[PDB]
């Protein structure tokens with residue numbers, strides 16, 4: 001009794017990861033009538049393994065249970081094999097076992113209200129391969145009731161669920177049981193008694209979803225899933241969580257007001273491998289590797305790096321100077337994957353001339369490649385997430401990835417080397433990263449050192465317009481292979497058009513419908529007729545997902561590429577930080593519709609009270625000055641509107657060798673005032689002008705103090721398509 005049909009929202013299809021093709025409602029994968037075991041079904045979801053469908057639970061009416069059935073669709077041309085799972089945010093609630101074509105649909109009835117569940121995940125796992133895995137969910141119904149008791153919070157101590165520190169056994173299942181218990185009491189406190197705890201893939205919650213700016217493995221094994229939670233404070237009590245294998249350590253997803261306090265995350269076997277340089281000459285480099293810390297084999301005289309259940313090849317190294325921990329000047333990525341000769345005694349001879357690149361005995365090579373399958377901490381469809389004194393020491397990708405979320409606060413902690421590991425490296429990519437977010441971002445009082453990329457990157461994802469189908473319909477593509485599939489437009493959200501050739505944001509529109517055709521292609525229908533200037537070759541970005549940014553009182557040091565990247569029109573405040581030997585530029589304002597397809601014009605940027613010490617000793621993409629403003633504009637001569645606007649650089653201290661201070665393209669209202677610049681000769685000078693401007697306007701350079709003393713004039717600026725009258729000075 002008491003069931004109503006589930007109406008699956010169109011937004012749930014856009015949030016679904018599905019391994020092949022399109023997810024359909026009330027039709028099979030093959031776009032025919034749903035049919036399982038010879039029996040027809042009028043309504044359901046036609047998906048294909050592997051897939052995972054997030055299904056929100058209505059607040060009204062009050063839901064007691066989800067009922068339905070599942071099985072292989074008869075439209076499959078062969079005998080597929082799928083395991084269906086109904087999941088909460090922390091546990092598998094029901095599994096079908098392996099289902100095959102011809103088997104009758106298997107029914108389920110899942111408790112919702114008594115588990116405190118407001119989001120379910122409907123997963124179809126491919127089992128072996130996904131050939132013929134046409135997977136149906138059918139007869140989906142909510143069992144509903146008149147009233148439900150409001151839950152009044154609880155304190156859940158993870159030790160009461162079997163979590164024990166100091167043993168190399170998987171503590172994942174215990175912790176996930178504790179999370180489930182806290183959810184069904186309405187949130188509160190999750191207490192973790194102080195200790196070192198181990199986590200492995202075998203007991204993680206296997207989920208399938210897309211993570212922006214990462215590789216796209218089909219399965220993320222989530223060890224600490226803080227998903228579908230409201231009003232939860234996780235008390236780490238200074239614990240250390242150690243991870244093994246390829247996993248997502250932490251996930252905050254479909255949650256509100258979740259905070260994590262006083263917790264550290266590391267891997268015993270890093271994603272990267274350190275080698276100490278022992279000897280060099282023009283043909284060879286001899287190194288030593290601690291094989292216990294970094295297991296490896298030499299296979300056909302090539303490195304094979306090894307962790308639990310994984311092997312990775314070598315692609316390149318980052319080279320770190322002995323004693324200082326700086327990235328060696330004028331190196332950047334050193335690409336190599338050559339002859340390795342074992343010498344015994346943990347010593348290896350590499351067929352590699354590193355001497356010529358400045359490497360010396362005592363230096364450290366961080367051996368790595370560009371693979372980034374899983375971030376350390378993922379925040380996804382979460383509102384008001386906080387990390388307080390959270391240290392993310394290592395990750396197989398970015399340490400912290402936040403996407404499609406609103407309001408995020410990180411205070412203290414950071415991405416730094418754990419004492420006693422002897423490492424110089426931390427994250428396998430960015431420290432923190434914010435892709436299509438909104439509300440306020442605040443990252444403060446943190447230490448970010450040794451990452452294989454920037455300390456922060458805030459941007460939108462812009463899609464390419466592939467075709468205008470009619471006056472209301474666009475075919476759009478996710479253009480970069482590491483930013484596909486996750487939702488970027490939902491019904492009701494606003495679209496901003498971008499003229500492709502000139503990188504000029506244009507008009508706006510409202511999404512009426514959006515259909516994901518596969519992981520890289522969507523069809524968007526807008527409410528009103530498209531502006532006539534919108535054509536194939538333009539781009540689109542979401543006008544509802546721009547965050548404000550406060551990046552303050554942090555230390556950023558000894559990291560690959562740039563210190564920080566910002567592309568958002570809301571206020572950006574970069575204040576009180578120390579950028580200490582960031583390898584590349586300290587700050588980059590980028591934006592493009594041709595390469596990374598990351599966009600978001602800055603309209604209000606304050607960079608004040610920072611200290612910049614000998615940044616930009618090695619060059620990377622776009623690193624033309626300590627502060628570089630480098631949107632990519634294919635036809636700059638034809639551009640009318642300036643991309644970036646109102647950038648204020650004041651009251652900073654630059655301790656720098658002879659390298660440009662400020663490079664900017666397509667920027668209007670750009671002030672470099674009341675800064676202190678102290679020049680040294682510790683690194684080789686570039687011999688270029690300190691200010692370089694390409695199609696800029698309303699530049700003011702005034703009241704700076706420079707040592708050794710000089711007076712800056714127009715002759716200290718390189719001007720390209722920038723009339724000299726647009727550059728003003730002042731005593």
Ligand SMILES: OC[C@H]1O[C@H](O)[C@H](O)[C@@H](O)[C@H]1O
Nearest residue numbers: 213429430453454457596598
């Ligand atoms: O330049 C943009 C680029 O910056 C860093 O390298 C990030 O790791 C990438 O994912 C991408 O955002």
Ligand SMILES: [Ca+2]
Nearest residue numbers: 081126128129
């Ligand atoms: Ca299969």
Ligand SMILES: [Ca+2]
Nearest residue numbers: 499533534538
């Ligand atoms: Ca156009």
Ligand code: NA
Nearest residue numbers: 019020021518
């Ligand atoms: Na496919």
Ligand code: NA
Nearest residue numbers: 154155156157
């Ligand atoms: Na309790």
Ligand code: NA
Nearest residue numbers: 637638639640
């Ligand atoms: Na012009």
